[PDB]
Write a protein that binds this ligand. Structure first.
Ligand SMILES: Nc1ncnc2c1ncn2[C@@H]1O[C@H](COP(=O)(O)OP(=O)(O)O)[C@@H](O)[C@H]1O
Length: 286
């Protein structure tokens, strides 16, 4: 769908469902909170070799495959799409598990179609799960990958040590993705709370401090909970019936208060275990 590419199968459904041309995703690297060093790495490894190819050849040959390792909800998929937008890269999002349920005919077309679209990025989430007869993909990736090497393959794992040696080989570069610090947390809370009616009474510094072990997904989960705690704070019987009532009309005027974060702060808890972040930090060195 650049020029001409057609091949009979009902598989084109899923592949095009995971594809995003450089037009579709208007993503921005500036729509990410923090990850300065991670943006810096992917920028030099993906964007710059496409803009200055005379410089990035020979001893400066760019990496073809890369793996992002970190606790869950740290933004590995965001940064994958954000660096594909900055570099005019056709984006492919492919979860490892979703393949095992859906498969070998997809991976072939996935790479064949990724190569068809000039520079493109194939993102693979939870590749640690790959390493029953799912050998049709858990290895078909390696033969489609060793041949495809234009096409950059970014992979993501929350369990980086459960990565077998067969995959450790193909992904030499390993970027550790950490948890947002106190300052990045604050901007993440304010970003999630952007267009939500709330009282000015809320202080985003206390929230940034109280959410120590939180990830970016935990922060937005804290925000969704506080926003809906407004509904919980309401009298239930007034909100009953299938017809619109004045009480439901009052629900709209409601602001998110400090109480709503307080309830949410006792509800959501960090999903990034203590020794689990170091599991990635040390693995990215050995
Ligand atoms: N650094 C960040 N900046 C902005 N949003 C973030 C950040 N980290 C996480 N998020 C939010 O968390 C959600 C899940 O992040 P995701 O990219 O799926 O991380 P992972 O790949 O680790 O699952 C996203 O929808 C995003 O809005």
């Amino acid at each position: 769908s650049f020029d001409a590419s057609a091949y009979d199968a009902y598989i084109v459904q899923a592949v095009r469902g995971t594809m995003a041309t450089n037009t579709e995703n208007t993503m921005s690297l500036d729509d990410i909170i923090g990850m300065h060093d991670v943006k810096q790495v992917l920028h030099e490894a993906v964007t710059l070799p496409l803009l200055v190819p005379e410089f990035f050849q020979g001893l400066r040959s760019p990496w073809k495959a890369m793996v992002l390792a970190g606790p869950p909800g740290t933004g590995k998929t965001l940064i994958a799409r954000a660096i594909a937008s900055e570099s005019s890269s056709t984006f492919f999002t492919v979860s490892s598990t979703d393949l095992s349920s859906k498969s070998e005919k997809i991976v072939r077309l996935l790479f064949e179609l990724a190569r068809f679209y000039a520079p493109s990025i194939i993102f693979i989430d939870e590749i640690d799960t790959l390493g029953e007869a799912s050998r049709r993909v858990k290895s078909e990736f390696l033969v489609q990958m060793d041949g495809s090497q234009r096409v950059f393959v970014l992979a993501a794992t929350n369990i980086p040590w459960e990565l077998d040696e067969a995959l450790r080989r193909r992904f030499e570069k390993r970027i550790f993705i950490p948890l947002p610090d106190i300052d990045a947390r604050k901007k993440l809370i304010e970003k999630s709370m952007e267009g939500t009616p709330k009282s000015d009474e809320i202080n985003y510094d206390d929230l940034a401090a109280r959410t120590e072990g939180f990830s970016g997904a935990d922060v937005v989960s804290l925000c969704r909970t506080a926003a809906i705690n407004v509904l919980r704070r309401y009298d239930t019987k007034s909100l009953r019936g299938g017809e619109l009532t004045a009480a439901m009309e009052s629900l709209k005027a409601e602001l998110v208060r400090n109480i709503d974060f307080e309830a949410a702060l006792q509800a959501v808890s960090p999903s990034a275990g203590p020794d689990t972040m170091l599991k990635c930090k040390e693995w990215c060195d050995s």
